[PDB]
Unconditional design. Structure first.
Lengths: 144, 187, 147, 147, 188, 188
């Protein structure tokens, strides 16, 4: 079924590689409650679930993966991973869930929802490959 | 890089290593050694090798279940791996060893559309990032290596080639028992 | 897969049988139309279950002995089981959760138009105070004025 | 969970091969954009299936013998299985249902803009006439007028 | 038909046959003959009838797997059929041979609330296009005059005379697998 | 209570007991007794207790299926319960009696990550409303003082004395049937 996990947003140093306190506004994270084909929202749900799991639940003496086996469907759309695998096998760009890109105003803090940087042929795509996507995103930003 | 004058392009990279405490993480050392970190203390090692370590055709899971010495998370992961193999019908191609709580499994990958192809497809799904080293065709994929060996191991600095990621295991969780054939009428 | 069941009727009305001493409860098109799109709403799932129960009893002839094959097929089409999984996760984590029993909605006194009910979260072996989730009520009022 | 497949080449056009006795037909970006959001659309699911067929024949090398493992993996990504479940549920109760064969859309005479095709419904083993669901056509026309 | 003053009503009709190379397509010849093409070369034939083809209460599934010799797609399709049967508990109803690499399965449909009605339920859900000819109120209490259901491989000809081919039955039933199965042992 | 003046807060409580004819209803009488309505004529009685009823290590489900003298809905609910147990590997723990068509399944619940923990994890979910009485931060290592879990069949009476009926909990467990089973053989 469709994901439901509530994103109880700010990404800390531990959640990121070579970055420090990337915080997105309410408008950007509100799109994760409706969008279904966004890798970043799924990883946000995964990281929030991991955070709440280590904080709230007592650690067992020996690790078990029953909880992730049960919550995987609530935290993430498995069919997004299926589609990324399908793009991977058919030799076209796909997302490995690592790198994302967004746009911020240089004068205001309002950010878009990050979108994944598609990998292809073992390397990240150039910015010119999907510059049309960036321009369309900025067009929707000025419109919205 | 600036778009529409005022906007500026910026990026982030998610650290999928802090998730070890709750999520198995695939990983790669080299083309003949991939890894699945279940926890900081323990993990599974998946090797593609010419040489074998199990010389018999007995898996014998039931006695292992009765003894209950194995690690439950590792058993769950290899169960997810085996049940994810599409169209597994040659039982003789699989052998195992579970002496004293050990976990060892061997798939004999010894041409288009066979059990070795299904095992390899599940292998590159489990270790999604780095298994591409070991495109255009997918319906039957073949590697020069003869055997695929799954074993338990203690966790070390194993990720030398590709970053850790949970995506392979989480993707294979939904695919369990989807392409299994019927072997008994009453099932 | 995503739920697809469409409530039959506009609006939607819950008769007294479907409610614990609350007579007929009717909701207009504004609240009911949200159930087409909203995924994380318990009340819409319960509406689909009750509508399916009504349709099944009135249309399909009852069997000689009860069979639950029909609900076993339609469970994923009528409800978002991931919502139940989330509520279970909050239950084990001691976070407040919904047991699908009690709901609350904001009722406009003059026009009579109501918002989509949200579930009254449960913890400590009881229902929460209104003070604990008053922020949710204020946000719902803010949304319901802003159109 | 939910569908994720995205069509490739900003409207979409069904060629002669994809249609039964009909030339190539193109739907604009506005109509196709509804397929990203709506979940209970049979036509969007069929568009995803046909696009995936086109990509699979185009890109992947043909095997020595046919294998259906690919769709066995990709069925949940390309279509909403619970939509088919709802269709079967309406089938077994003699409610009108869609067998994914015939569709209808509104088409502007001058501009050529079109609404998203809605599936034609069958009951008693025969297509419902244009009169039975004329309310659906008129309300879709009201939506298309509001745009 | 003109609506308002400018909106023309027009209709599509999708051609499912072009999806043959990548999916099975459930079909129907008449009430007592249904077909499932897997590509343009081969397929399954699902017939309701009264005559036996198998006269033994055996089904060499394990030996069939050991020897291979069968088409893997057809094996997976019949596996999806069998695993999709709701509430199956009578193994003696099913029979099969699989000798020489062929495929031949027989379900013995010879009362309300039984194993035969589940087989008919899955049979209709497979050949969804034209199995209705073979009541709505009597759901889960269905019965047919035919005694046997034979699922056997075949080479492909133009069999679709009653209803068009379509993949929807197989794709819809792929989610039914291992959903209503009983437990036959303490460890699955 | 008036929120922002114009608006008034109102509440409704759904009568989920009217969903009896279409789907089963989990319910709780006390920490030691829980029930599952399947229609107004029958149901299952789950009990954590100290006194066993089985006193042998036999679960002849296969003979129970061949005879086919049981209620199919109850057997399907038992199958959903058993398959939903995460990481069940001790077949000796479960022992069941289906003599004369009845249903009687005993789990021997006699430390983190045990079979008793998985059985209790499924038990707390099958009766989701009101089984908590049987430290909420401890999930994986749940262990109750009771020694056995006994699941029997029973004609329905007004057993709901602590918690209301609820279809939720069975509908949740339907989606976790074959998601945590260990492999027991090379071919499934
Ligand atoms: C599996 O996943 C877990 C997370 O789920 C992960 O644990 C985390 O490891 C990272 C390191 O890899 C820890 O990061 C450090 O965090 C502390 C702050 O502690 C927080 O977390 C602890 C534990 O929960 C809390 O008790 C505490 O209150 C905090 O919440 C930081 O102080 C560390 O900063 C050091 O590194 C920075 C970057 O280089 C430096 O700028 C900084 O100055 C620090 O370095 C210096 O000080 C150190 C401390 O004196 C010293 O050791 C250095 O030599 C240097 O002088 C750092 O960010 C994170 O907290 C862990 N979180 C948890 C929950 O455990 C496991 O590591 C991961 N396991 C595997 C196998 O990788
Ligand atoms: C998602 O996908 C992205 C893109 O593929 C991955 O990012 C890359 O990850 C790989 C593997 O970790 C990186 O490859 C490594 O590059 C190192 C040098 O990097 C710098 O120099 C190279 C040119 O030499 C530049 O192209 C690059 O941008 C950097 O400036 C090498 O030292 C590493 O060596 C390792 O692999 C080689 C074989 O390739 C072995 O011989 C070595 O012994 C050693 O094992 C390695 O080649 C790559 O640089 C990354 N690119 C970027 C820009 O990030 C993500 O890791 C991936 N994420 C997941 C989780 O899948
Ligand atoms: C897995 O089991 C086989 C079979 O062992 C026998 O049958 C079992 C069901 C159980 O009752 C065992 O105690 C039995 O011994 C093992 O193969 C046996 O190996 C021993 C030692 O060489 C030999 O004496 C037996 O004859 C073998 N049995 C047969 C039937 O050939 C096998 O070793 C077990 N697997 C592993 C990895 O140890
Ligand atoms: C397999 O089933 C066979 C019977 O299957 C039929 O006949 C076969 C010869 C072959 O043509 C199959 O495709 C047919 O479906 C079993 O054969 C007999 O089994 C009994 C025990 O029940 C045994 O005593 C006999 O020797 C077997 N042979 C004959 C000729 O009767 C066979 O046991 C099953 N198992 C295997 C592993 O083959
Ligand atoms: C459960 O079955 C066992 C095994 O008996 C076999 O399986 C039965 C289901 C049925 O098919 C029998 O005909 C089979 O023989 C029963 O154990 C047997 O009990 C009888 C009577 O005491 C005894 O004479 C046999 O030797 C036993 N066989 C074995 C292998 O132990 C058992 O009785 C059944 N369970 C219960 C609770 O009665
Ligand atoms: C893996 O499979 C291969 C192929 O079946 C096995 O090699 C065969 O071994 C038998 C028995 O000695 C010989 O008769 C065959 O000629 C061999 N074939 C080939 C292609 O080498 C191999 O032994 C298997 N390995 C294991 C450990 O079971
Ligand atoms: C795989 O698991 C086995 C069993 O746990 C490991 O071997 C055991 O090591 C522990 C260490 O405390 C001993 O207590 C057991 O008696 C050992 N059993 C065996 C099988 O000898 C083995 O080391 C693990 N794998 C690796 C490579 O570490
Ligand atoms: C919200 O409050 C209004 C206030 O009028 C309710 O209106 C009720 O309408 C019914 C007929 O539909 C009358 O019989 C009742 O007497 C009215 N109640 C009151 C208090 O005036 C309306 O039903 C409420 N909405 C919901 C969904 O409960
Ligand atoms: C199976 O379907 C394929 C397409 O998936 C058909 O191939 C097309 O056939 C039409 C016939 O009018 C040609 O115009 C197209 O050029 C063909 N396309 C491709 C990609 O080959 C094929 O004819 C179908 N086969 C059968 C036996 O029905
Ligand atoms: C299919 O099952 C039916 C029973 O459901 C079998 O018919 C029975 O055959 C036995 C043979 O000894 C007779 O004693 C019974 O009277 C028959 N029953 C009925 C109702 O006619 C039938 O033979 C089975 N078919 C196959 C091919 O095995
Ligand atoms: C969906 O249902 C319609 C209506 O029954 C089917 O249309 C029939 O198709 C058959 C096969 O070509 C024709 O012989 C009939 O004349 C058609 N009837 C009408 C009203 O046109 C259609 O085939 C079904 N589609 C699928 C894919 O099952
Ligand atoms: C089982 O549910 C049925 C159907 O919801 C209940 O029958 C209803 O009973 C109420 C009063 O309790 C009547 O107002 C309704 O008209 C009845 N509906 C139907 C369709 O019969 C029945 O009471 C419930 N039984 C139990 C034992 O809980
Ligand atoms: C349930 O299992 C426990 C053990 O897990 C059984 O208790 C053991 O019974 C044997 C019988 O020979 C005694 O020797 C042991 O000392 C007992 N152990 C403990 C810890 O009490 C118990 O009898 C089993 N119950 C049933 C009904 O089979
Ligand atoms: C949801 O939780 C609430 C609060 O714990 C439950 O309310 C109790 O319901 C029983 C039913 O017999 C009453 O006896 C109690 O007095 C109620 N408690 C309170 C504080 O009002 C409710 O039953 C639960 N619902 C479900 C379906 O599990
Ligand atoms: C907002 O833009 C500023 C200025 O470039 C940048 O520092 C910041 O990272 C952006 N916001 C986020 C959430 O990254
Ligand atoms: C930019 O993208 C182009 C188009 O593929 C590519 O050729 C070029 O190498 C890229 N630039 C880099 C990697 O600096
Ligand atoms: C592994 O994790 C435990 C806590 O779960 C910690 O005490 C121990 O030091 C860690 N060992 C490592 C990082 O290898
Ligand atoms: C929650 O409620 C339970 C049951 O009434 C009570 O024992 C417990 O202390 C409560 N916990 C907190 C933190 O309020
Ligand atoms: C829609 O109508 C216009 C005008 O009649 C026509 O040119 C166009 O081809 C039609 N398009 C479709 C989708 O039928
Ligand atoms: C069509 O189905 C309806 C609903 O079951 C039924 O009443 C009607 O008799 C059927 N068609 C005819 C006219 O036989
Ligand atoms: C409605 O359908 C019937 C066939 O059931 C048809 O005869 C009739 O002409 C249709 N409506 C009109 C008024 O055309
Ligand atoms: C089924 O396939 C076998 C080979 O596996 C072949 O001999 C047989 O003729 C096929 N059946 C039919 C009816 O064509
Ligand atoms: C729970 O109710 C049952 C009703 O028969 C009763 O026998 C049992 O003793 C009760 N629980 C306890 C432990 O008092
Ligand atoms: C359970 O069902 C059997 C018949 O299958 C019946 O005889 C028995 O009385 C039932 N159990 C109870 C407690 O009524």
């Amino acid at each position: 079924g469709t994901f439901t996990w509530t994103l109880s947003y700010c990404l800390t140093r531990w959640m990121l590689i070579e970055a420090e306190l990337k915080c997105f506004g309410n408008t950007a994270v509100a799109k994760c409650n409706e969008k279904h084909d966004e890798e970043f929202c799924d990883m946000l749900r995964l990281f929030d679930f991991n955070k709440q799991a280590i904080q709230r639940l007592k650690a067992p003496a020996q690790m078990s993966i029953q909880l992730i086996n049960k919550a995987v469907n609530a935290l993430i759309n498995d069919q997004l991973i299926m589609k990324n695998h399908l793009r991977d096998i058919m030799c076209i760009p796909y997302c490995n869930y690592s790198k994302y890109w967004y746009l911020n105003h240089t004068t205001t803090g309002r950010t878009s929802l990050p979108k994944c940087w598609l990998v292809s042929n073992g390397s990240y795509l150039n910015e010119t490959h999907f510059s049309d996507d960036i321009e369309q995103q900025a067009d929707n930003m000025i419109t919205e | 890089s600036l778009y529409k004058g005022v906007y500026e392009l910026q990026t982030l990279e998610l650290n999928m290593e802090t998730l070890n405490m709750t999520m198995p993480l695939s990983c790669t050392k080299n083309n003949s050694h991939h890894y699945i970190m279940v926890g900081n203390e323990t993990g599974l090692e998946l090797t593609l090798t010419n040489t074998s370590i199990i010389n018999h055709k007995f898996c014998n899971l039931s006695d292992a279940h009765k003894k209950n010495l194995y690690d439950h998370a590792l058993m769950s992961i290899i169960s997810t791996f085996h049940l994810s193999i599409p169209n597994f019908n040659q039982y003789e191609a699989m052998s195992c060893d579970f002496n004293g709580g050990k976990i060892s499994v061997q798939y004999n990958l010894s041409h288009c559309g066979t059990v070795a192809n299904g095992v390899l497809q599940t292998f590159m799904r489990m270790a999604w990032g780095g298994s591409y080293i070991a495109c255009g065709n997918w319906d039957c994929i073949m590697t020069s290596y003869q055997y695929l060996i799954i074993q338990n191991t203690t966790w070390e600095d194993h990720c030398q080639f590709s970053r850790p990621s949970p995506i392979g295991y989480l993707g294979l969780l939904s695919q369990r028992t989807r392409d299994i054939y019927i072997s008994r009428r009453l099932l």
